[PDB]
Amino acid sequence: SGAIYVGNYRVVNRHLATHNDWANLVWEDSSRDLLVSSTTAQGCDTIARCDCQTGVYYCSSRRKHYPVSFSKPSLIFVEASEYYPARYQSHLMLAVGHSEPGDCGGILRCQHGVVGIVSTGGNGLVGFADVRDLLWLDEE
Ligand SMILES: COc1ccccc1[C@H](O)CN1C[C@@H](C(N)=O)CCC1=O
Ligand SMILES: [Zn+2]
């Protein structure tokens, strides 16, 4: 589990969104595994606006932050889970790292700010849903 709190937005994995998220919906995209809801309180996270390919992510199944090298956002085939059919997930970045299904939500960050959140993985892989192209998270 986990979310990004930027401005008056909450960014979560679409597959982990709550009823309150769906009842206060700003935007959702199944192909990216992302959903954004509105918040009453202002958040403290800042979004990175860059093309970094190195950063650090939080892994809840190890209580640890790991430094990683990761691929550029791409269209990558993801194996069937309890949330999605085997399919093509867009704007996904992969790295070598430990990951398990409850780790979705952990933040990946670079020197510029938050890059994205854990969305996939398995066999020493971890996939991150990028958020750096969502420029509207910085306003309104
Ligand atoms: C962190 O992910 C894992 C970890 C260990 C093993 C397998 C995985 C999966 O890739 C994660 N997965 C895919 C998600 C998606 N974005 O399509 C939907 C829900 C899900 O369980
Ligand atoms: Zn960066």
Name the residue at shortest CA distance from atom 17 of ligand 1: 84
CB atoms within 10 A of CB 87: 11
CB atoms within 10 A of CB 107: 22
Say which ligand is closest to the CA of 99. 1
Q: How was this structure determined?
A: X-ray
Residue 99 CA, ligand 1 centroid: distance in Å: 9
Asked if residues 10 and 3 have their Cβ atoms less than 8 Å apart, the reply is: yes
Bridge partners of residue 88, in order along the sequence: 77
Model resolution, angstroms: 1.2
Say which ligand is closest to the CA of 16. 1
How far apart (Å, rounded) are the C-alpha atoms in residues 138 and 33?
20
**Whether residue 11 has its Cβ less than 6 Å from ligand 1:** no
Instruction: Of 75, 134, 127, give the one whose Cα is nearest residue 105.
Output: 127
How far apart (Å, rounded) are the C-alpha atoms in residues 35 and 15?
8
How far apart (Å, rounded) are the C-alpha atoms in residues 138 and 7?
7
Backbone phi, psi, residue 97, to 5°: 175, 150
Ion ligand 2, residue ranges at CB < 5 A: 48, 50, 52, 110, 112
In a 10 Å sphere around its CB, with 0-12 CB exposed, 13-18 middle and 19+ buried, how is residue 65 labelled?
middle
**Whether residue 57 has its Cβ less than 6 Å from ligand 1:** no
Domain segments of the chain as ranges:
3-44, 45-140
Annotation says 44 is catalytic: no
